[PDB]
């Protein structure tokens, strides 16, 4: 009863998933991926692309900051380093925190991570 309706939106730097289908305020949108396909890359790809644009509504990105809080688990040795690569590329790691429990870090720690 302390929860209100969506009334704002975010922009992930893409076309089809922000024009044709607006990713709104506090939306829970799952991305069903396959197997034999790299989930992980197509993820972080959209990391740097995503910088919000509520410009057109009359609000800044100072009243909508770009904070990436990431919690994976059971990720490969390449992929876990390929993640940090994207971030360290261009400035976006002094406004975000990573957490990512390696596939060689115990199954007990998996759960609490989030």
């Amino acid at each position: 009863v302390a929860r209100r309706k969506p009334e704002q939106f975010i922009q992930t730097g893409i076309s089809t998933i922000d024009v044709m289908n607006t990713l709104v305020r506090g939306q829970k949108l799952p991305i069903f991926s396959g197997s034999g396909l790299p989930a992980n890359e197509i993820a972080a790809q959209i990391a740097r692309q995503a910088t919000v644009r509520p410009d057109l509504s009359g609000e800044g990105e100072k009243e909508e900051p770009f904070a990436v809080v990431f919690a994976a688990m059971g990720i490969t040795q390449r992929e876990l380093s390929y993640f940090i690569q994207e971030f360290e590329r261009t400035g976006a790691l002094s406004r975000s925190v990573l957490f990512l429990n390696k596939a060689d870090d115990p199954t007990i720690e998996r759960i609490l991570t989030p």
Binding site: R89, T90, G91, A92, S94
Partner: protein
């Protein structure tokens, strides 16, 4: 005379040709200027991208 007919027949083709060929030498001069123009516009766009990105990188580092 038949010959007074014929001289009007060359002077007729040889003006159409030379207007067609100054309507290609105009068209090319336009499309090339608008080309040259757009290839420096695109040059403008690139420079911004590469400077906006760069300043952010060097800020985050510091």
């Amino acid at each position: 005379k038949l010959e007074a007919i014929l001289s009007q027949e060359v002077e007729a083709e040889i003006q159409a040709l030379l207007q067609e060929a100054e309507a290609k030498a105009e068209a090319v001069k336009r499309e090339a200027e608008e080309k040259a123009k757009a290839l420096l516009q695109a040059r403008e766009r690139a420079l911004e991208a590469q400077y906006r990105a760069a300043l952010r990188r060097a800020e985050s580092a510091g």
